[PDB]
Design a protein around this ligand. Structure first.
Ligand code: WHW
Ligand code: WHW
Lengths: 173, 173, 173
């Protein structure tokens, strides 16, 4: 297993989330679809790597937990390195695990599960991929010691500003 | 290979299915989207395990077969144990095989194919997962001898009523 | 690794693509969903094999490239042989790689990645699957030398007309 952590940040400049509201209910419900795309940073928050991109399908409102259950299908993009794809549950009120459905580029052959931790609803999430199947060790610029997750984390200023020192080559946008 | 069978039943209490109509047709057509979530029971029908959850994308109506072709992306949830994710053909008129795209929890590393068997449209289905890649033998409460599929199968009364003897721990709902 | 090349062609007879417009702009944007299904032919263009089927989720317009980024979830159907499922990036303006999430039939256990090459937007594409995990060698009628990719490719007359010599057994439709 190679652990890979990343931070997903919604900086609200990608038209995301887009809510397609169709459910029988005022609250989120089955029928509601949420296409989305957020920014993706390294686990040590030093570099912008790319984006998340995909679809959240509402399954139910969970009133006891004051939150929603989604079924999510999406990918994580790492510039020229490639991408990872996942499928599984996103619960707005607690951590979950998703399936790693595959990958491309350096992530070809990827399998396993990924831990999803929401830090600030809906703007900050922290992921830990427990990656199996890779052909090589991950590049060092992706495996810096992760910043421990908390509501107070922020990407490095130079990564948010897209300085060359704060981005990977041809980071996904 | 570890065979795992489950029954999927729409008990009409989860607002499912939800039809998002966009095809210019009285019948299902390309454009129509169907988010869904049904109940999942063990193959021996003794216990409630969880739910299915995901999306059926209508591909075409097939008049000569009196049914529809869907393309389906969804997951099968087994309470505290984890989940399985699938992708592939969902035909209302005949049995099919779908791809196992991955899993989480005890299903981490899962791969192979799953047989979707028609039972009673649009209420009951029977599945057999041909599971490869699991870390351990499946728990016994999930691998009781399956009830042979027929139109008149029913979950055990304790399972339907969600009594502790009829559910797995933290059964998904 | 086993390489498998196929041509995907929109012959305008499957109601595809269907544009579900939800972004407020005239251009494609997040919120727009595109269910689709095209015809699939062998790499040597001698035989109809089946169809593609699934969903393109618009992620963003890319004005500097005069094109779109989609996130795609779909399958490739090969008649009685089975199917392959994929997840990943679909860019209207340049080639990409998608993840192979799994398969069924002769493609049970499939993993790897697939190169998507656009030939004519929005009508013709060429794919090269880098397939791992297959139980057997691919059937010879799928592994003929490909026609050189260009905007001018056409299926053999017998394949377009669905004569026995121009189709595989129970080709998907
Ligand atoms: C276990 C099978 C249960 C239901 C089948 C549906 C589903 O979960 C996914 C696709 C199917 C769509 C059937 C639509 C026909 C009926 C629509 C109206 C209704 O049943 O309330
Ligand atoms: C084999 C490729 C055939 C069609 C490509 C489409 C598809 O099957 C899935 C996504 C694509 C969407 C195309 C939207 C085109 C709308 C613009 C029409 C134009 O190019 O003038």
């Amino acid at each position: 297993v190679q652990e890979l952590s990343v931070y997903e940040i919604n900086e609200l400049d990608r038209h995301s989330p887009k809510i397609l509201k169709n459910a029988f209910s005022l609250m989120f419900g089955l029928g509601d679809l949420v296409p989305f795309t957020n920014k993706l940073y390294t686990g040590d928050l030093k570099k912008r790597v790319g984006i998340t991109a995909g679809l959240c399908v509402v399954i139910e409102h969970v009133p006891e937990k004051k939150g929603e259950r989604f079924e999510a299908t999406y990918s994580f993009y790492f510039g020229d390195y490639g991408h990872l794809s996942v499928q599984g549950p996103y619960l707005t009120y607690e951590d979950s695990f998703l399936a790693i459905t595959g990958g491309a580029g350096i992530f070809e052959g990827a399998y396993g599960q990924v831990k999803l931790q929401q830090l600030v609803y809906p703007t900050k999430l922290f992921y830990t991929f427990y990656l199996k199947g890779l052909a090589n060790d991950l590049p060092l610029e992706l495996t810096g010691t992760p910043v421990p997750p908390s509501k107070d984390i922020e990407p490095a200023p130079e990564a948010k500003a897209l300085e060359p020192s704060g981005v990977i080559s041809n980071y996904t946008n």
